[PDB]
Amino acid sequence: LSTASVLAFERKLDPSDALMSAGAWAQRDASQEWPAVTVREKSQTVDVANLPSDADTLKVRFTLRVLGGAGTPSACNDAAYRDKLLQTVATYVNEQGFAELARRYAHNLANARFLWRNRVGAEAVEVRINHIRQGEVARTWRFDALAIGLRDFKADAELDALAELIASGLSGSGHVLLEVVAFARIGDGQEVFPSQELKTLYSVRDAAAIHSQKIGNALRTIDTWYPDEDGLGPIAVEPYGSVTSQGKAYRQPKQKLDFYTLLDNWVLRDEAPAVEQQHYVIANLIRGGVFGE
């Protein structure tokens, strides 16, 4: 038959905004008096993040909670479609629980992809990941500098613990809350660049920061096998796999390798694709949106 006339999915892996701060190196344990990056109006209207003279490194503090329960949709019209979508995602998580998806999300949390202009040219970028369930730390994590990369993903001796934590949260059996901060040495007075509004830079109170949707977009860079090639690296999850920076929308509707074309014969026609395309459809269900007509 047909799909739902209206159907939608709430997002998972909730990001906040990332408050920027400036400080000195080897002060990473004491980032509680690092002054926030102030935007000033100095004349041609420019907005430059003037770091202080006694402050070289940038620390971008944000938080991330994963929710779980990616199967159940928000508001589905058809009563005969919700149960078959739940059965589809249930057989998916029963044949192979999304541990490789959680590994790739952990690798997204490894290198500071949420930093976009403030990641290039950096000497060393250490992300510090906490895990807080009651109001204090449970098992913190420190990350290396060569394991940062941008495309080299591998089973690291401690990234497997972060990946199994993200999988245990996303499974739907107890959510997690991670305070992800990132220290990076950029340059004294060098203009680190957060997001900008309609120049007007985006600013939460008494600081500058990055939008939540930009950090989420940087954090869901999972998509590897799209039919054009896979040489340049992984792109971010999108139903049509679109990328504005490269400038050409991939995953064309003439081919049936798109998300709307893969789910539609996954649930109706029972044409289950390969494990990478099932990972793609499921990772396109962890980002939400308004599907259907």
Place this chain on the structure above:
Amino acid sequence: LSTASVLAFERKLDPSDALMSAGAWAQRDASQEWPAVTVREKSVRGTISNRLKTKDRDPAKLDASIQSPNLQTVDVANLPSDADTLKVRFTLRVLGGAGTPSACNDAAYRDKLLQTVATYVNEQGFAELARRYAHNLANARFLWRNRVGAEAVEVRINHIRQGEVARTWRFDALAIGLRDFKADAELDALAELIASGLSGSGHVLLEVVAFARIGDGQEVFPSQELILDKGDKKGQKSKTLYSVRDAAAIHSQKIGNALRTIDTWYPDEDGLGPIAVEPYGSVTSQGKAYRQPKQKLDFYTLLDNWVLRDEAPAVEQQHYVIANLIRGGVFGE
């Protein structure tokens, strides 16, 4: 004996405008000075992810789509990042007198209706409906999307006697599930209080404060206002959020909708949970209509059966007609 041409009931158990505030957990015992989460606007540039007409061969429009990206301005509400819990505070008065209409034409119909509700509250008092209303106040169901993915949410319900505080109930919304109506001990006193309010003996004004620890600076979800298309390419053209003078706030009908999820007695399903008491009991978030007018379980059908022809319906759905008389509305043709 025929029904009334216009029939109208007042709204009992009318809630206030749920404000929203932010703070630190373990300071919520003295949370009388917490600041407000402000509705802050932010620009968002999204690509095109809609379900267009499939099997479109050329990308000649799809490659210029990303070249002409969709610029938008949304309004978002986040906590202060040095604050991990969200405090939603709202009052509700339980008026009482749930059988007397306010616009009834016929003096012969209103007497039968008044004696029908009188025999109802005589033989089977409001304590069933009051225990289910106290259940919906107990678990923070009115925290609509601020409850999913929460570390701990506790509800504090005060009874304001004469400006002071008569009785205080401290709850735990995660232990009291959103599915089962479990007869507990401490909320049974709140059930007797709500039943003594709905009965009409003494009025009650509850003050309900729900704390949910969600995360430092996370995204809270107040209600979403309608946008009137009077603007250009900037100026909250996509999503505006409800806000009284400073704080982001939840609508009164939304928090009153979450308070009246009292029927698990719709015939089609028995494991889906409770839906809200409406005539032709429906849910906008599922596109469905439980208690269709084909089967004789709607509200108008059983109401006319009870009043006009004196067919006393099933005890499990004698609660439902009263449960949406407490809601009130515009009944009769």
Place this chain on the structure above:
Amino acid sequence: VTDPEALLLLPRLSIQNANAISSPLTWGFPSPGAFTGFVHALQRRVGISLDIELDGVGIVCHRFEAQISQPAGKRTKVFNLTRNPLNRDGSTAAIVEEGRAHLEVSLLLGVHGDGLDDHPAQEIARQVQEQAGAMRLAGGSILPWCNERFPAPNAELLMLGGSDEQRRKNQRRLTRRLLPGFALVSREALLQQHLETLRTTLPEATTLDALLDLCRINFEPWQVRDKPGWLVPIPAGYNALSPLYLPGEVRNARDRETPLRFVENLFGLGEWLSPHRVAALSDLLWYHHAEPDKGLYRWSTPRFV
């Protein structure tokens, strides 16, 4: 009747003090026979030297203001006259009533000859546009362009040369500059079937004409019938009532080289349809064809739908 190779568009053309009356029974827009005669005169002036032919017209009427007045609470109109010079004495004796009108028309002419075969494309259009500005199109002078935003857009659009989607794009590009107008086309078949509709009592064509263009109000035994379109009565050529003559036979002819006939107007039907609602523009060209055996000398538009 031959389909043209090209549709030479004559632009926004303000013509003043035209003939409003144009027929013994109509008073509105001038006759389309004036337009076909105008194109034949323009052919006789420029086309013999340009080695082309010119047959059809597209009558679009961008704006139209008549020289009329509604006299003092009446449902009719009267015509504004012009004071004539005096006789041998100061009589002001004869006052013959003829109407005037100012109309902004824009024609599109069907070309047949050696347009692109031996001549350029823009130069032929420039020559015919600066040739049609020194003559008169309906009985009144063709006003030139002296105002601002100098157009001169004589689009000499080729039709039979190009692919089909490019040809449809050319048609919808030429229709862009017919933007507020209204093309006039004959509907002889519509008047015929509307005559066969009300043939229950007496199938007179002059009665089916005089009971269609009106608003026939008729209640319920309380409405007016549904308006099928913008139907107008137009003169649709002449009809002879005297046999043919010799050139020098009939006294006081216009010239003694061509024969004379005594004729009488024929009243056809017409519609003012928008130029978007036609498939091709060459569907709405007015040609005049004659059958000198009988008395019919009829202008019309073939392929009008």
Place this chain on the structure above:
Amino acid sequence: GQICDEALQYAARLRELEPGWSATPGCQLHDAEQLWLDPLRAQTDETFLQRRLRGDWPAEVGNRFANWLNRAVSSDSQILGSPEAAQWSQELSKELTMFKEILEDERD
């Protein structure tokens, strides 16, 4: 068809003898929804003036035509029991798509 033609004729007659179309006091909505009845190029245009001065499409026009077709004929919840109402709805959708394809080439 006569209603669509009258709307097209009014849209053609409006933006022919009114060259005033630019920034001014009380001209905010006359740049996005006014893509049909929009003026020519300005005197102080920018480099990428194909979006902020004159967008190359009737972007707000199609929804306005759909809303005008929905408001001009009061369609009910039982207006498709036979193909009579649904055929008029399909004809209205086709006429709106044709008017959108016509208005898309207006800014060029």
Place this chain on the structure above:
RNA sequence: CUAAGAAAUUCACGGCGGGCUUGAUGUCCGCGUCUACCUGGUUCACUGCCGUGUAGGCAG
């Protein structure tokens, strides 16, 4: 080669004097707008410069 070709509506003027529109009123009852999104088009195909002339190196 067009119901073709042709055409001066002119001169003058006191609208004007008056006035009570007024009395009374129950708009009522009720509601889930939801989910997602890289502005890194150039918020000016820039900005003070060795000579009033284009010939440039210090967060350029």
